[PDB]
């Protein structure tokens, strides 16, 4: 069973992205990089409709070798994905997972979390929903991309004139767990948003 009380593995606080300057926490990438499973729970108030990276994790000598935990105005999601080869090229792209979800946001602040389960599946959590499901016998996470070499809050950092996705708004907080938290938990935590 789970525990009733699980301290954060990454804790973050009040992260000003009004000029959508990205927050670097590189300085914690060795507690993340080779996780197979864990939670991640945000709450956040963008100000714009296009793809912003919450949490990025990745090689920044690649393209496309990165985690990026994102929203819009109308949708949350993920993308795991790895890449073989660095620098200028897409080749050796392995495209690993997407999973999103079309969902109404509230104008001020939002509540998500992403919740992976080895070897059962990923779930995403919206203010005080379980809003999608995708179970998987096989899953992947951080540990499946190679080289791993940077994290931030608010960007995702890639290799050369890539999308960065830039978060702009405020990010209340952030934690990341090692662990798959209860979906009871995170059905009221991220209710507080409701
Ligand atoms: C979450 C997501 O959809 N991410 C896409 C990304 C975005 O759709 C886009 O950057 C948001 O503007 O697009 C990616 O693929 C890109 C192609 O759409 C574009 O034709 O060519 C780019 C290369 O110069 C790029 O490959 C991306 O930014 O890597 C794919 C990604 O999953
Ligand atoms: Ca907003
Ligand atoms: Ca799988
Ligand atoms: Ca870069």
Redesign the pocket.
Known sequence: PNWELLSSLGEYKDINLESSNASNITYDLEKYKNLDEGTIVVRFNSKDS??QSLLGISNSKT??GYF?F?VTNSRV?F?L?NQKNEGNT?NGTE?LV?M?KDVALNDGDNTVALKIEKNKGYKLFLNGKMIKEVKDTNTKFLNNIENLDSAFIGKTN?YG???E?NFKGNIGFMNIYNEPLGDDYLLSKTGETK
């Open positions: 296009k793809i393209k496309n990026n994102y999601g993308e994905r897409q495209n997407h999103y890639r004139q890539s999308n996705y």
